[PDB]
């Protein structure tokens, strides 16, 4: 990918770049999933051994406070601001807020809201004054790449994201193990209740949670499962990674062309009865200028 920016890239030292990041050593892991209930179109399989070079990855998704500093330093205008609207979950749109008649096919719970963007996540009249440490949302893939490049970083590949999110466990269902609420404790922010009609908030949150909520995984990463979907570098496909080759098994970058970029990790909206996509092997995509109230990102870096 060859992005274009209207800000210069500042000089930063290795020590500055690595703050808040964990060093993932080079090695192999078992990527992918073989859950019999996975949707075939998602291409969770095959399970395969992948070798990665050492890399750094953020412990936390990028926060509102951090994105605000980027915007203050650069004047960056996000895709949602340029388009003038973004997607908000229906239950979070205050009555009377102007909304578009737009229809996401098959997903009527998504509302296109004029004026919804990272600083006003539910549209005009909303703010992030009480959410400085929540993940920034309404950021597109382009916005994420712009932030990451300004920060001296990049987006993780899907394989880097998944190795870090798995946290040293071999083929577990979730970042922490195989049980969703071990010891009766919520470990991530997803939906409870009856999707899309009623979220009970059993895990404490019916929207985003702070980026440091819940226990970390074994590598010290927080909210890799749930909270917000996270952009990765790769173009999406369901089958590029079914090939067994060095390109798909050593530092794999995904297909060279595509239409949508990969997102990992699930969000506060995911639920077993609908998508079941908060398992660590799960994956979906979105087009790169798209934005939504449940999608953000974390950065990676070469040491």
């Amino acid at each position: 990918h060859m992005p274009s920016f209207d800000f210069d890239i500042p000089r930063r030292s290795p020590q500055e770049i690595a703050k808040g990041m964990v060093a993932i050593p080079g090695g192999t892991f078992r990527m992918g999933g073989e859950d019999p209930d996975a949707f075939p179109e998602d291409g969770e399989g095959p399970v395969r051994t992948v070798r990665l070079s050492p890399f750094l990855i953020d412990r936390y998704a990028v926060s509102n406070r951090q994105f605000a500093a980027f915007v203050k330093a650069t004047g960056y205008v996000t895709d949602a601001e340029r388009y003038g609207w973004s997607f908000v979950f229906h239950a979070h749109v205050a009555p009377g807020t102007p909304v578009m008649d737009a229809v996401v096919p098959e997903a009527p719970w998504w509302v296109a809201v004029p004026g919804a963007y990272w600083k006003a996540p539910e549209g005009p009249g909303s703010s992030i004054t009480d959410r400085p440490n929540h993940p920034v949302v309404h950021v597109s893939w382009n916005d994420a790449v712009a932030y990451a490049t300004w920060a001296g970083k990049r987006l993780p590949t899907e394989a880097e994201w998944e190795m870090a999110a798995r946290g040293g466990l071999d083929q577990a269902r979730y970042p922490w193990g195989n049980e969703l609420t071990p010891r009766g404790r919520h470990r991530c922010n997803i939906w409870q209740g009856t999707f899309p009609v009623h979220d009970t908030g059993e895990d404490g949150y019916t929207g985003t949670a702070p980026v440091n909520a819940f226990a970390p995984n074994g590598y010290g990463l927080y909210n890799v499962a749930g909270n917000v979907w996270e952009w990765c570098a790769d173009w999406w496909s369901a089958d590029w990674h079914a090939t067994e080759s060095p390109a798909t098994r050593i530092d794999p970058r995904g297909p060279e062309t595509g239409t949508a970029r990969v997102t990992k990790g699930g969000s506060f909206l995911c639920h077993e009865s609908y998508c079941n996509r908060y398992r660590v092997a799960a994956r979906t995509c979105n087009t790169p200028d798209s934005s939504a109230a449940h999608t953000g990102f974390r950065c990676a870096a070469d040491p």
Partner: peptide, 16 residues
């Protein structure tokens, strides 16, 4: 009925 949707795209709402 079809694959569940978690990523709502700007392109998806264009239809005439």
């Amino acid at each position: 009925a079809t694959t569940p949707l978690c990523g709502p795209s700007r392109a998806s709402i264009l239809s005439g």
